[PDB]
Ligand binder design. Structure first.
Ligand SMILES: N=C(N)N[C@@H]1CCCCNC(=O)[C@H](CCCCN)NC(=O)[C@H](CCCCN)NC(=O)Cc2ccc(cc2)CNC(=O)CCCNC1=O
Lengths: 154, 38
């Protein structure tokens, strides 16, 4: 299956079937976060997906071709996280991003807290373009979570 | 062995629930790809 869309990333090495993350299929390339797969090969039905590009520092990895996703947050509008939590239906959640201010520039961030296996779910703009992936962030004072909107370079 | 299975189309939902605030946070990204608050 290479149809564009969002996919669960599953393993059987633990008890039951376990969702370890999420990713995006677009233009025949599968996009997820590095910590989901650690760069390992993936099965899709009877076919195999071999990694093509990845970068631990960005926490990103692509399969079957180079990173395709290049939209970016406009810095002004709300976005939607299309969360795909383990064992639950995909659900859109709208929010206005905050900002990670870093020495090398600023990055949209979303203050939404989902289970760890939700890593790699796409964040979309109002045109439905994927502006980045959910799941690399920080834990704030009260103990909840803020994820960077992590995007690669096409 | 990891495997993938489709979970949906990628599309904006007009009736989406809305939540979450919009913090401005100073952060650093280390060579491990981990963010930390500054
Ligand atoms: N913690 C909250 N509220 N939600 C997280 C949601 C995480 C969404 C998916 N992203 C990740 O899984 C990535 C993997 C690492 C990327 C490395 N590039 N993880 C992080 O981005 C932070 C970044 C921290 C970097 C600091 N330098 N790591 C964690 O949260 C680890 C952590 C796990 C569990 C607790 C507390 C902390 C206790 N809570 C609980 O068990 C509630 C249920 C589990 N909830 C959670 O796992």
């Amino acid at each position: 299956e290479t149809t564009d869309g969002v996919y669960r990333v599953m393993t059987r090495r633990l008890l039951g079937s376990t969702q370890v993350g999420v990713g995006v299929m677009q233009e025949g390339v599968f996009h997820t976060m590095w910590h989901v797969t650690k760069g390992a090969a993936l099965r899709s039905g009877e076919g195999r997906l071999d990694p093509y590009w990845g970068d631990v520092k960005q926490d990103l990895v692509s399969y079957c071709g180079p990173w395709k996703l290049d939209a970016a947050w406009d810095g002004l509008s709300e976005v939607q996280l299309l969360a795909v939590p383990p064992g639950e239906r995909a659900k859109n959640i709208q929010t206005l991003p905050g900002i990670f201010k870093t020495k090398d520039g600023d990055i949209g961030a979303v203050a939404l807290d989902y289970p760890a296996g939700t890593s790699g779910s796409p964040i979309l703009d109002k045109c439905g373009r994927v502006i980045g992936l959910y799941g690399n962030g920080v834990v704030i004072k009260n103990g909840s979570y803020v994820s960077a909107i992590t995007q690669g370079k096409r | 062995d990891m495997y993938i299975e489709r979970a949906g189309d990628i599309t904006w939902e007009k009736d989406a629930e809305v939540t979450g605030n919009s913090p401005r946070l100073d952060v650093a990204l280390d060579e491990s790809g981990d963010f930390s608050l500054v």
